[PDB]
Design an enzyme around this catalytic site. Structure first.
Site, mmCIF file in Angstrom:
data_model
loop_
_atom_site.group_PDB
_atom_site.id
_atom_site.type_symbol
_atom_site.label_atom_id
_atom_site.label_comp_id
_atom_site.label_asym_id
_atom_site.label_seq_id
_atom_site.Cartn_x
_atom_site.Cartn_y
_atom_site.Cartn_z
ATOM 1 N N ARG A 1 0.940 -1.310 -0.014
ATOM 2 C CA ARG A 1 -0.015 -0.093 -0.046
ATOM 3 C C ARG A 1 0.839 1.206 0.055
ATOM 4 O O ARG A 1 0.651 2.198 -0.582
ATOM 5 C CB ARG A 1 -0.926 -0.034 1.493
ATOM 6 C CG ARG A 1 -2.164 0.835 1.053
ATOM 7 C CD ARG A 1 -3.166 0.820 2.272
ATOM 8 N NE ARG A 1 -3.694 -0.337 2.535
ATOM 9 C CZ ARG A 1 -3.619 -1.219 3.536
ATOM 10 N NH1 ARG A 1 -2.978 -0.480 4.595
ATOM 11 N NH2 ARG A 1 -4.272 -2.275 3.738
ATOM 12 N N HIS B 1 -10.603 1.373 -6.869
ATOM 13 C CA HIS B 1 -10.356 1.540 -5.638
ATOM 14 C C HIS B 1 -11.251 1.587 -4.737
ATOM 15 O O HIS B 1 -11.620 2.412 -4.055
ATOM 16 C CB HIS B 1 -9.409 2.767 -5.392
ATOM 17 C CG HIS B 1 -8.534 2.940 -4.302
ATOM 18 N ND1 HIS B 1 -7.264 2.328 -4.132
ATOM 19 C CD2 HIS B 1 -8.708 3.404 -3.108
ATOM 20 C CE1 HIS B 1 -6.698 2.207 -2.937
ATOM 21 N NE2 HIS B 1 -7.653 3.101 -2.225
ATOM 22 N N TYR C 1 -16.781 20.412 -6.364
ATOM 23 C CA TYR C 1 -16.504 21.749 -6.777
ATOM 24 C C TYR C 1 -15.079 21.872 -7.597
ATOM 25 O O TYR C 1 -14.975 23.000 -8.236
ATOM 26 C CB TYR C 1 -16.602 22.652 -5.607
ATOM 27 C CG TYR C 1 -17.722 22.791 -5.024
ATOM 28 C CD1 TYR C 1 -18.913 22.869 -5.915
ATOM 29 C CD2 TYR C 1 -18.087 22.402 -3.696
ATOM 30 C CE1 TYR C 1 -20.301 22.853 -5.296
ATOM 31 C CE2 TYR C 1 -19.209 22.505 -3.092
ATOM 32 C CZ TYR C 1 -20.434 22.738 -4.043
ATOM 33 O OH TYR C 1 -21.711 22.790 -3.415
#
Ligand code: MG
Ligand code: MG
Ligand code: MG
Ligand code: MG
Ligand code: MG
Ligand code: MG
Ligand code: MG
Ligand code: MG
Lengths: 506, 496, 506, 496
Positions: free
Chosen positions: D10, D56, D100
Site C-alpha cells: 500500500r 479503488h 467543486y
C-alpha cells in the site's frame, strides 16, 4: 524536538510515529491506551462502582487528552473490553462489544464501561509520585508518561504496532507464569533463558487452542524473533449407533474470525477444493465454541480434518517479533530483557513510592504538632486570636512567641522532621517555634475539634505516623527489605488474578 | 410518527430563547466550564469533549459545527462565541480542526444565560440521567428574533431571519407599554429583518405579511453598482454586499460559468478582491456592453438577488406553533416575567437562609466564652451539637443588629428570638461547630454585621418586587433598556 | 430559480428540499433513487446478466450523477435490495445486505448487485424519448426526470420523506390489486373510492402481519390521511402431552426491528413489567420468522400475549399521509388521484413512445430506399464513384442525378415519408431524387452488402417497416386502441410479477 | 504477517515509476478518461467515481486526497495534476469538495504515462477481475527521485525527498555514459534534494551518506533575514521560505505560543503577510532586543529549521530494498531500456499487420471489376469470403508498391506474393468485404500507397533499433534530453 534528536537517522516525524505506535516496554501501553485508562481512573470509573456510558469516557479523553476525531479512542475502549482480544481485559464492558465473528460494537452512547479490577493494579500508586507526568496538548492537564503497573502487561497482554517499517508482534502470556518468571529473576539476576522458560513455557492466548513445537518459542525468547504455529482444538467424533463422523471445533487460533473461517470452509466445499463434507454449522453460544463439521459417510474424518488444517486458518503461524521502547529507543528485546525492564520498573516505582509516603508522613506529623501544641494552649491562643484584630495579625502574633509544649511534651520524646524544615523551627530547647504555615493550620481548625475525642484522635494519628515513618525508613535502609516489598506485591498479584493456562504447548 | 416528534424536537427553536437543543447543549457546557468572555480562550476540543460526554453522545459533527456557526460573523447576527483561529469564511471553506481553534463565550452569550444559577428555568435529565440540562435559557436577549432560526436544511419548516437588537428591544418596550399595540404599531420599532451580511431587502409587503401571519416571502438584493474608470472610460461592476447565506465563491463561479456559456454577456473579467476588510467582487464590463444592463441581468440570473421564505414556526407550550411578530414578542416578555419572578423568589430564600446562619454566628460570638467552655467539656462533636441546642443564649450586643422579615419561611416558631433568648436550630449548631478559629478576631463582628445589614437591604428590595407587579415590570424594562445600551448596534440591512 | 418561484411562499432552498425529499407521484422515485437505477440501466446491469460489484455502481453514480460523499447512494442500493424494506425489490443483491435485525450490509466492495427483473419494467422504453431528461451537475450527462414506469411504484413500494415540515407516509401495496384498481379506473373514469377499494382493500406490507380495522384505510384512501393498526401474527400453542403454553410469533408489523423487539421483551421481563414468561428465543432462520415465547405453567397464554400487544411493538399504528409531487407541487393526494396520475402517465408515455417509433421507422425506411435504389443501380453507381476523385465528389455527384427506380419501383407502390423530408426529395414523377445524407448511406455501405442475401434482407425490412408504420398510425388514430395498448401492458405486468397478498385485513 | 506485505504494498513506491498503488490507480483513470493536459477540465468527482468503481473500492478519502496532493505546488516538486478551484494551501486548510474542484493531467503526467498503449508495461487485474491496471507506468520522468516519496505517516520506512528534474536527467546521462561512474561522479550532476518549497539545506555530509547508503539525515532551514526600517531603526525578521512540509499557520502559532510563554523573547508583533505572490512572515523585533539573536533562537525552537531523515526504501523486483543513488538511477535507466524495447516490438507488429491489410486492399483495388463481379455472384457473405480466398489475384499496378520485411512474422508462406500471384488470407478477405464504397474513389490509391510507404519507413526504422543496442541507447538518450528540455527548471533549494 530539534536539540534532542541530532543523532538518530530519525527525524521529528519519524520519532512521533515511534512514540505513538510502539508500546513502552515497562507497562506495554502506547499513549492512546495510557490516555483512556488514565481518563477512566480520573473519573473514578472503578471496577466496583457503577458503569458509566462509553461516550462519557470518550468525551473526557477527547477533551483533555486526545483531541482528534479518531475512532481510536472508542476502538481502544472496545478492544480492552473484548475477551477474545486481551488475555487480561482492562475494561469491564456492558452491552454489545462485538464478537469473535467480527461484528461491530454498538455506538458509544449504548455501551457502558468501567475499569476492570486488574486495571487498578496497572495504575496502582499513580498518586504517590511514582511516575513522571507530561503536559497534555494545551498545557491544562497532566498525563502519566508510563503507568506504575504491578502487572507485567506487555507480556501478559502482548502487542502490535508498526513504526518506521519496524513491526512489533508480542503474543499474550499467562500472568501466573510471568509472575513466576519475575520472581525467579529476582532471586537470580543470572538466571538463563532456559531457566526462565521453566516458568514461562510459551505464549498463552485468550482464545486457547494449541501451539505445535517449541523451537519457535525458544528462539523467540532467546532472540526476540521466532515463528510458532497455532492449531485449532478439534477432534473427530464418531457416533456409536450410526458411525457418522463429525468433526467438532472447540477452540481456534488467536486473531482468527470465526465467521470468516466458516465462510471459507463453505466456499472450499462449493469449489470442491475440500471433499467429504455433508454439513457445516456454527453451534457456538455464550458458553463456548462449537463449529460442527459433518463428514460424509464415504469419507474419512481424519483425512477431512487434516485437509482443513492445511487449507484454512484452522492452523496459522504467528511470527513473534518482540519490539518495545526502552529508555526511549525502539529495541528488539529477548525474554530476559523484558522481565528485567519490568522488575527494574517495579524497583523505581516502589522507591519513589516510599520517598513520597515519607514526605507525606512527615508533613502531616509536622502539622499535627502545631495543633497538639495548640490544643494544649487553648486559652492563651483563643485569648490571643480574640484580641488580635485581623487573621493576618493573629498569624504574625502566633509566630512571635514560642509555646510551652504542655502535656504534648511527652508525645515527642526525631525522624518525623520534614527534610525541608529549617533548624530554627520545631522544638528548639524546651519551646515550640511555629512555621508560618502551621499558624494557618491553627487558625484554620474548627471549633468542632476542641472536643474530648480530639486528643485521643490526634495523639493516635501521630503514634500511627511515627510507626509508619519507622517502616518506610527501613525500606529505604535495606535493599533486601525493598526487594521483599516487590516480591510480596508480585505474589499478591499472582494470587488475586492468576489463572489456569489456556493454550496447550506440544 | 414518533420519528416526527423527534425530527421536530431536534430542529425546532424554543420560542423563548431561540435555541435548538444542540445549541442549548453547547452553550450550557461552555457556561458550566466557566469559559467566560473575559477568561482565557479554551481549545474547542475541550468543549466538544465535554458536550459529547455529558450531553450529546452522537457521532454527528453537529457539536463542533454549532460552536463554529456561533462564531461566524456571516452566520449569526449576534455571535455567541468569541473564537480565535480559522473558523472558515464566507466562501464556505471549513473551519480548522477542533484541536486548533479556541473559544469562549461572547459578552452577549452571558446575557442569554443570565441567572441560570438562580433556579430560573427548568432542568431536564441528560441522556443517561447523571446530569441536568436547562430546558430553556433565562435569556435577556430576544434571541429568536435577533439571531433567527432555520430548519429547512433538515426537512423542517422553521425559517426565521435575524433582526436588529435595538429595534427588537424597543419593540418589546412598546409592547410592555401597550399590550394592545398592533402589528403596524410594532413595525415602527422593527421595520424588518436585519441580516449580519447587510445588503438590501427590496419591498415591504412580504415583511408585513410575514409579521402579521408568521408567513410571507421577501427579496434580498446585493449592494452593487457601476463604476466608470476616470482614465479609461471602462465600466466595472463592484459587488460590496450579498444576500444572507449566499456563498461568495459559489456565486463567483456561477457567474464565471454563466459567462463561459454565453448565457450572460458583456463581461470581460471576473475577480474576487475581498480583504479581511471588505467584500469586493470585480466584474469588468466590456467596452461595447452597458454596465446597468449587465448588472440587471446578473440580478436576475444569479444569487445577487434571492428570495427568503419567512415561516415563523417555533416551540411554544411544548408544541410547534406558527407565530406572528406580536406572538413572538409576547412569548419573550412573558418569559422575562417568569424568569424574573423565579429569580426573585430564589434570592429571597438564599438571603434568608444565609441571614439565619449569620444570626447564629453573631450569637456564638457574643457568647464566645460560655460556648468555648461548653464545646471543650464534650466528648463527641455529636454531644456538643445537642448541648448547644439544649439551651437558649442571651442576644448579647447582637440585640442591636436584629431588632421581622429575615426568617426563612420554613423556620418553625420554637426557634430564633423568643424572650431575649435565642433559640438555636441544629443546623445552626453545625455552623457554630464549623467556625474556624480565625473567625474569632475582631474582624468577625465587622464582616458579619456588614453582611447581615446587606442581607436586610436586599430582602427589603426583593419583597418590594413581589409586592408590586408594577415594580416587577419596571425591573424587566430596566433590564431590557440595559441590554439595548450595552449591546445594541446599527441596522445593517437597507429596506426599500 | 428566481423567475420560476415568484408565487410560492417557497424560496429556492425550500424548493430544493421539496424536490429531493418527496417522491414524484408518477414513478414514486426521488432523484437519488432515479439516479442509481438509471446508472445501473446505463451499465447494462440487467436482471439476467452477471452481478456487478456494488462499488462499481456507486462510483458511476458518484461520478456522473450524484457527486456527494453521502452514504445515500450506497444505502439506497441496499434498501432497494432488502425484502423487508421494499414490497417489490428493485435491486437483486448478492452477499450481506443486512437483516430484519438491523445489522449493517457489508461494505460496497463485498456485495454485488444487478437490476431486479421488475426494475426493467420501471425503466421500460427509456430510450424511446418517452420522458424528459435534465442535465447532470456538470453538463456532461443526461438524467431522466421521471421513469417511464409500467409499474405503479409509489403505491406498490410506498414512500417516506419530509420537506418543509410536510411528511410523506405511504404504505406499500399489492401489485395485482393495484393493477386491478388501474384497469377498473380505465373503464370508468367515474369509479368511486369505494369502487376502487373493491380491488385495493388496503395496504400490503412486505413483512405480512395483520391490519385491524378498515375505518383507518377508508379515510386514508378518501382523504389521503388516516391511521391504521398493524398487529403481529402470533397464536398461543399448547402442548398435547405437557399442557405447556408457548406463544409463537410468525410475522411482525412493518418497519419493526426484530432484535430490538426481543430486547424489549427481555427487558420488560427483567422489570417484572410483563409477567408469565419462562423463556424467550429467536428461532428464525432463512425460511421464516419464529420468535419463541414460552409461558410459565401458572400463567395464562392468552393473557400474556394480550399484555405484549399493548406494551410492545407486536402492535404499532402507522399514519398514512399520502403526499407526492404532482405537476411540481407537493400535494396531499387521495387514492384516486394517485391512480389517475399513474394512468395518465402511462398515456403520455405510450403516446410519446408511439411518435418516436414512427419517426424511427420512417427514418429507417427512407434510408432503405436510398440503398434499394443503389443495389438496383450497382453498375452506374460504382462506375460513378470509381471515376469521381474524392468521397466529397462522389457525394455531390450522386445527388446531381435522379435514378431510374429499377426493380425497386414495385416495392414502393405513402405514409413512410419522414415528417421532416422536403417535397422535392423522394420519388418525384418516376425518378428518385436523393437526400445528401442518403448519399452517405450509399458511400458508407460495405462491399459485403452487394451479395444475394442483401435484396432478400432489405425488401424484407421495408416490408416489415411499412407493416409497423401501419400499426403505429392506427394507435395515434384511435384513442380506444391506445388505451388498449395500456390495458394489455398492465395486464401483462399483473401476470408476470403479480403475487399473493401478504398482510391480512380485519 | 501477511498484514505486513499488504501494509508494505500500500505504502511503498515502485522504484521504476515512483508511485504507490493508489497513485498509479488515480493517474491511470485520468488517462483512460482522456482527461488530458490540453482538453477541458473535468470535475474531480468524475475521476473520483471512476477510480472508486473500477480500481479503488474502499471508503478512504485516499482517492480524492491523492488527486489533491498531485495538484499542490507545495506538495509535489513536479505536479501531476493541473487543477482549478480551491485545492487548500500551505496553511493546511482543506481542499473544496470534489464536486467543486476540477482537474486534468499536467503536461508532465503524460510523460509519466508515455507509451502506455504500446504494450510497454504489465497489467494486473483489478479488484474484481473486470478491468486491468498497469503494474508500473512506462515513465520518461525519473519520478521517484524527482518527486520523492514517504510512508512515514502510515508507519512505513520510505522517506525520499524530491529532486530537480534537470539535475537528475543529467545524472542518468552521466550513468548511461559511464555505467561505472561513482557516487561522487553522480553528485556532480545531483548535488542534493530540491524541494518544491525552496529554502536552504544546511550541510553536505548527510546528503553524501544518504546517496551512498540510502540512509542519512539532512537539515532544512528557512530563508529569512533581519531588516532595519530606514525611518525608525526598528528591526524586523521577514520569513520568505520555510522547510518542506512545514505548515505555515502551525509554525506561526508555535511562535505566538512560544512568545506568550516567555519561552522566546524579543518579539513585539507577529503577522502573516503572504499573498498569492510570496510567503512573508513578519516578526517584529523589540527595540531593546537584537534581531540576529531572536532569529537564532527561532531557528532552534521552531520549525524554521527541521531535520529530514532520508531512507530510500522502494520496491524492486517485487521487494522492499534499501537503495542508494546509483541503484535508483540504474533501476530507471533499466526501465527505460525495457520500455523502449517493448515499445519497439509493438510498433513493429502493429505496423506489419496494418501493412499486410493494406496490401490486400490495394490488390482488391487493382482487381476492382473481377472482385465486384465475384461478390455480386454470391448468396452468403460467407460464400464470398471462401471464394475471394479460393484463387490468387495478379498484383496489378500494385507490383510497383510492394517489390521483403513487412510480412508479419505469424504469416505462413502459402500466403502473399508467390509468382506474381497474390495469395489471400481469410482475414484479408474480410477487410475487402468490409470496404465501404466511398473507398473506391481515386483518392484511395492515394491515401493507401502513402500509408504503405509510411509503414515501410517506420518498419525500416524499428528494425534499425532492434538491430543495434547502440541505436536503442541513443533513443533513450534523446528521450531523456527531450524531457530535460521541455520540463527542466531551476534549482529551488540552496545547499550549503
Ligand atoms: Mg498529544
Ligand atoms: Mg436515536
Ligand atoms: Mg438526547
Ligand atoms: Mg447543497
Ligand atoms: Mg444534481
Ligand atoms: Mg482489506
Ligand atoms: Mg486492491
Ligand atoms: Mg499530526
Amino acid at each position: 524536538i530539534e536539540e534532542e534528536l541530532k543523532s538518530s537517522y530519525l527525524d521529528y516525524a519519524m520519532s512521533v510515529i515511534v512514540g505513538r505506535a510502539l508500546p513502552d516496554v515497562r507497562d506495554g501501553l502506547k499513549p492512546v491506551h495510557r490516555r483512556v485508562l488514565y481518563a477512566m481512573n480520573v473519573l473514578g470509573n472503578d471496577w466496583n462502582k457503577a458503569y458509566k456510558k462509553s461516550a462519557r469516557v470518550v468525551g473526557d479523553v477527547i477533551g483533555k487528552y486526545h483531541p482528534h476525531g479518531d475512532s481510536a479512542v472508542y476502538d481502544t475502549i472496545v478492544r480492552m473490553a473484548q475477551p477474545f482480544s486481551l488475555r487480561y481485559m482492562l475494561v469491564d464492558g456492558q452491552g454489545n462489544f462485538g464478537s469473535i465473528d467480527g461484528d461491530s460494537a454498538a455506538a458509544m452512547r449504548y455501551t457502558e464501561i468501567r475499569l476492570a479490577k486488574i486495571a487498578h493494579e496497572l495504575m496502582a500508586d499513580l498518586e504517590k509520585e511514582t511516575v513522571d507526568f507530561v503536559d497534555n496538548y494545551d498545557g491544562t492537564e497532566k498525563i502519566p508518561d508510563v503507568m506504575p503497573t504491578k502487572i507485567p502487561n506487555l507480556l501478559v497482554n502482548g502487542s502490535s504496532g508498526i513504526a518506521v517499517g519496524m513491526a512489533t508482534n508480542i503474543p499474550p502470556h499467562n500472568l501466573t507464569e510471568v509472575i513466576n518468571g519475575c520472581l525467579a529473576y529476582i532471586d537470580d539476576e543470572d538466571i538463563s533463558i532456559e531457566g526462565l522458560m521453566e516458568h514461562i513455557p510459551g505464549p498463552d492466548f485468550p482464545t486457547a487452542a494449541i501451539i505445535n513445537g517449541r523451537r519457535g518459542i525458544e528462539e523467540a525468547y532467546r532472540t526476540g524473533r521466532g515463528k510458532v504455529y497455532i492449531r485449532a482444538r478439534a477432534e473427530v467424533e464418531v457416533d456409536a449407533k450410526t458411525g457418522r463422523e463429525t468433526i467438532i471445533v472447540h477452540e481456534i487460533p488467536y486473531q482468527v474470525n470465526k465467521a470468516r473461517l466458516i465462510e471459507k470452509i463453505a466456499e472450499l466445499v462449493k469449489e470442491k477444493r475440500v471433499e467429504g463434507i455433508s454439513a457445516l454449522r456454527d453451534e457456538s453460544d455464550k458458553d463456548g465454541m462449537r463449529i460442527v463439521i459433518e463428514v460424509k459417510r464415504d469419507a474419512v474424518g481424519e483425512v477431512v480434518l487434516n485437509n482443513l488444517y492445511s487449507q484454512t486458518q484452522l492452523q496459522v503461524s504467528f511470527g513473534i517479533n518482540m519490539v518495545a521502547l526502552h529508555h526511549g529507543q525502539p529495541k528488539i528485546m529477548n525474554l530476559k530483557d523484558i522481565i528485567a525492564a519490568f522488575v527494574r520498573h517495579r524497583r523505581e516505582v516502589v522507591t519513589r513510592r516510599t520517598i513520597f509516603e515519607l514526605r507525606k508522613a512527615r508533613d502531616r506529623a509536622h502539622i499535627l504538632e502545631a495543633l497538639a501544641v495548640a490544643l494544649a494552649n487553648i486559652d492563651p491562643i483563643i485569648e490571643l486570636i480574640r484580641h488580635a484584630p485581623t487573621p493576618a495579625e493573629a498569624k504574625t502574633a502566633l509566630v512571635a512567641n514560642p509555646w510551652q509544649l504542655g502535656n504534648v511534651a511527652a508525645m515527642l520524646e526525631d525522624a518525623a522532621r520534614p527534610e525541608w524544615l529549617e533548624p530554627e523551627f520545631g522544638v528548639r530547647d524546651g519551646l515550640y517555634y511555629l512555621t508560618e504555615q502551621q499558624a494557618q493550620a491553627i487558625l484554620d481548625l474548627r471549633l468542632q475539634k476542641l472536643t474530648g475525642l480530639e486528643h485521643e484522635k490526634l495523639l493516635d494519628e501521630y503514634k500511627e505516623l511515627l510507626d509508619q515513618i519507622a517502616e518506610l525508613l527501613r525500606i529505604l535502609g535495606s535493599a533486601d527489605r525493598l526487594m521483599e516489598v516487590i516480591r510480596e506485591e508480585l505474589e499478591l498479584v499472582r494470587e488475586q488474578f492468576g489463572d489456569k493456562r489456556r493454550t496447550e504447548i506440544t
